[PDB]
Design a protein around this ligand. Structure first.
Ligand SMILES: Nc1ncnc2c1ncn2[C@@H]1O[C@H](COP(=O)(O)OP(=O)(O)O)[C@@H](O)[C@H]1O
Ligand SMILES: [Ca+2]
Ligand SMILES: [Mn+2]
Length: 255
C-alpha cells in the first residue's frame, strides 16, 4: 500500500499543484504524485499509513469557520451549524474520527452508537457522532482515549504526547508564515501500536515525516478540496486558532 487513490476534485488538485528555519507547508502534506484516469479521475498520493505495523489514526478537522468563499448559501448555513454545536466553533478544531486498536477497558465505557467493531480484527472505527458530541471540556479526554493503546507502556505513550506537542509547535510556526486559506482540512495523527516495531526502531521517532521521493508516529495535513494559496494575504488565522488550542491541550497532558 504505497499509494492512495482519491477521487480528484479540481480545487484539491489545484492546491497540490500550487504548493508542490521553519518547515514548509508541503513537508506536512502527503506527496502528491499525479493523476490516474480510470472517465473517473483520481489523485495519486503517498500512503501515510505505509510502513506502520499497527497504525492508530486520528482525524482532527481544523478551523472555526467551516465554509469557503464559494460555498452555496444552503450549505454555508449547514457549516455554521456544525461549527456552533461542536468544538470547531469554540476551540478551532474538532475530532472527525479515529481508527484505533481497542482497549477493552476503554470499550466498556463507550456507548455502542459511537463506534463500529468487527470479529475479523482488533480495530474499532470511532465515528463522526463521537466527535460532534465532544464538549470544550471533554474533548481532551477524547484525545487521551486515542493514545490509550493497550499494547504501549505509559512511558511510550508519554513519549508520543511529547512528540506531537513538538510537531504542533513546528506546525504552528509553519502556519504563521503560510499564506493560504484552508477550509475543512484535517490534521492526521498516526502512531505505531505494535510494540515490536518500537523495539525494532529502538523507541526512536522522527519529528518530521520521511521524504517519499528523496516513523513510530506522524502528524500530517490532508484534504484540500476547500483550500487555496493566497499570496500576499497573510497567514490563516482561522486554522491557527485550532493549532493553539491543540498546543494548550497537549501541554496539559504533560503537566
Ligand atoms: N495520504 C493518505 N494516506 C493515508 N490515509 C489517507 C491519506 N489521505 C487521506 N487518508 C484517509 O482518508 C480519510 C479522509 O480523507 P480526506 O482527505 O479527509 O477526504 P475528504 O476530502 O473526502 O473529506 C482520512 O481520515 C484518512 O484516514
Ligand atoms: Ca532493537
Ligand atoms: Mn476530511
Amino acid at each position: 500500500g504505497l499509494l492512495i487513490f482519491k477521487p480528484a476534485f479540481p480545487q484539491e488538485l489545484e492546491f497540490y499543484k500550487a504548493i508542490q528555519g521553519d518547515a514548509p507547508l508541503c513537508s506536512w502534506m502527503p506527496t502528491y504524485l499525479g493523476v490516474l484516469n480510470e472517465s473517473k479521475q483520481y489523485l495519486v498520493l503517498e500512503n501515510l499509513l505505509y510502513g506502520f505495523s499497527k497504525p492508530n489514526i486520528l482525524d482532527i478537522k481544523l478551523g472555526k469557520t467551516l465554509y469557503d468563499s464559494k460555498a452555496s448559501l444552503e450549505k454555508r448555513e449547514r457549516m455554521k451549524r456544525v461549527s456552533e454545536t461542536t468544538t470547531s466553533g469554540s476551540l478551532g478544531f474538532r475530532i472527525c474520527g479515529m481508527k484505533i486498536q481497542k482497549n477493552p477497558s476503554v470499550l466498556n465505557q463507550l456507548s455502542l452508537e459511537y463506534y463500529e467493531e468487527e470479529a475479523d480484527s482488533d480495530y474499532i472505527f470511532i465515528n463522526k457522532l463521537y466527535g460532534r458530541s465532544r464538549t470544550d471540556q471533554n474533548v481532551s479526554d477524547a484525545i487521551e482515549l486515542y493514545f490509550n493503546n493497550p499494547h504501549l507502556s505509559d512511558a511510550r505513550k508519554h513519549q508520543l504526547k511529547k512528540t506531537f506537542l513538538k510537531r504542533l509547535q513546528l506546525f504552528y510556526n509553519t502556519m504563521l508564515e503560510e499564506e493560504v486559506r484552508m477550509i475543512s482540512s484535517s490534521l492526521l495523527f498516526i502512531y505505531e501500536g505494535d510494540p515490536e516495531r518500537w523495539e525494532l526502531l529502538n523507541d526512536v521517532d522522527k519529528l518530521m515525516r520521511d521524504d517519499f521521493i528523496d516513523s513510530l508516529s506522524s502528524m500530517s495535513l490532508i484534504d484540500f478540496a476547500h483550500s487555496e494559496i493566497t499570496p500576499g494575504k497573510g497567514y490563516d488565522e482561522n486554522v491557527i486558532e485550532g493549532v493553539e488550542t491543540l498546543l494548550d491541550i497537549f501541554m496539559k497532558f504533560l503537566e
